[PDB]
């Protein structure tokens, strides 16, 4: 579909959000899994999914993160794939199925 | 993480 | 049909909606059906077809009481299937 | 193509609005035509096209109401058909 | 019956 | 294109709004043109369209002053076709061209 | 007739 | 279970 | 796709909203252009594209100042094709 | 694919926003990548993408920040293409 | 002419 | 330049 936020489509436009960054999340991950801050905290929100995520712990990787809560999101499945979304979600969905029940 | 209420 | 709420489209971000679920139906078995707790006593509500349900009673199955008050309902129609919610109105 | 009211769908989603339905017109005649009730007097409403009908008359048939005010909806094409429409007129 | 505005 | 005013589709529930209508055109003649009463002097409005007219003259003709004023509407269209259209403005076009230069 | 404003 | 209004 | 002002669609719609026109450019020429008045000064508007133009100067044409402003306008287009329009911007 | 300001999609069009630009970056290479004048400080907006940019810089190239910034712009894609976009990026 | 927002 | 939401 549509992005939620076109004008955070490129990967240098997410990153500037960042800048002064205090948390153990890379803020280069984050912004190479569509994220980008929203100025409250560790609040990221994808310019795509629109989903956003809060309170991120040490070790998370945002894509991971990004496949948990949204595996509903096109940019997380143009860019990583069914498969990968299946592993996350640990099951073995249709062709071209969301994976919604599990 | 967790989804922003 | 695009779900009403995006945001609930996956499994997790339904199921975290019922927190410490203190009502008889199974929160999973809800979560699994499209539905997330609204946050007002059990009510629930579906993320695809914006339907939603209140007053469950213990026994209740999820995909049944979805498909009986919401046979238009798309998420529904994708897992469940024609047959299905035809034989739940006889 | 899409119905106004997406939740009244089902026939039992329209037809629980009424139950202190107390008019002429069957309850269970109305909600297969695709009615469900406003809760405001007799107004009815089409979940589909969305029209409206009120003062209901004694012995009056949903369908053919609906058919004569809204022969446009499509709900009442897909379920009737030209025939009955054009009948109706 | 009739249409209600 | 989609009709402004669906409730208003059908000529029946457009008969229904002059019913007082005490005014030089026919009734009768307003809602087979499209038209339905608004409730104001002689404004009419036609269903598919949204055009509205009103000053309604003596001896005029709906179909005429609706294709006069809205050549553009789908509703004249598919009832009248493009020959009645084009001939009240006096010119022709070619193949699905609409009048809008005269 | 005339349009409506 | 119901609908909700 | 659709324009922005339907009712406007036809010719004798937009010429009207001129009434007594008191301005240097001619407007049965800015009518047939796709341009009606807004009712303000002198400022019209086109049905389609929705572009407004204001400060017309004596002996200008509607349709270059139409094509030069606001190529993109698919009424402009279709009157005029892109010959008309590139000649225009030269 | 539609333009966020479609008023704005001509090059005089936006062009005559930079009438009193007060800033160095070039007025005329920055209607030519999209971009049209705002009002607030040096900012300025793409017709198309809807993308806003400030703060230039002395000798900046506004169809490079352009891609730079807003590389999904579609405006963008259709006169520079896949390969100038790439490029920009490393 | 000039355009007028 | 840099962006200005
Ligand atoms: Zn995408
Ligand atoms: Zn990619
Ligand atoms: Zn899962
Ligand atoms: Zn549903
Ligand atoms: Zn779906
Ligand atoms: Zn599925
Ligand atoms: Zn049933
Ligand atoms: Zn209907
Ligand atoms: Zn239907
Ligand atoms: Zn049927
Ligand atoms: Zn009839
Ligand atoms: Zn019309
Ligand atoms: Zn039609
Ligand atoms: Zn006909
Ligand atoms: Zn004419
Ligand atoms: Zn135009
Ligand atoms: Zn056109
Ligand atoms: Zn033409
Ligand atoms: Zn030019
Ligand atoms: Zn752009
Ligand atoms: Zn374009
Ligand atoms: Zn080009
Ligand atoms: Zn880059």
Same mark, same amino acid.
């Given at each position: 579909?549509?992005?939620?936020?076109?004008?955070? $489509?490129?990967?240098? +436009?997410?990153?500037?959000?960042?800048?002064?960054?205090?948390?153990?999340?890379?803020?280069?991950?984050?912004?190479?899994?569509?994220?980008? +801050?929203?100025?409250? *905290?560790?609040?990221?929100?994808?310019?795509?999914?629109?989903?956003?995520?809060?309170?991120?712990?040490?070790?998370?990787?945002?894509?991971?993160?990004?496949?948990?809560?949204?595996?509903?999101?096109?940019?997380?499945? *143009?860019?990583?794939?069914? *498969?990968?979304?299946?592993?996350?979600?640990? $099951?073995?969905?249709? *062709?071209?199925?969301?994976?919604?029940? $599990? | +993480?967790?989804?922003?209420?």
């Amino acid at each position: 579909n549509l992005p939620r936020n076109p004008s955070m $489509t490129g990967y240098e +436009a997410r990153l500037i959000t960042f800048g002064t960054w205090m948390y153990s999340v890379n803020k280069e991950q984050l912004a190479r899994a569509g994220f980008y +801050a929203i100025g409250q *905290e560790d609040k990221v929100q994808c310019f795509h999914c629109g989903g956003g995520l809060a309170n991120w712990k040490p070790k998370e990787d945002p894509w991971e993160q990004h496949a948990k809560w949204y595996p509903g999101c096109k940019y997380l499945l *143009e860019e990583k794939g069914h *498969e990968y979304i299946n592993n996350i979600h640990l $099951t073995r969905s249709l *062709e071209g199925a969301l994976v919604q029940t $599990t | +993480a967790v989804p922003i209420a």
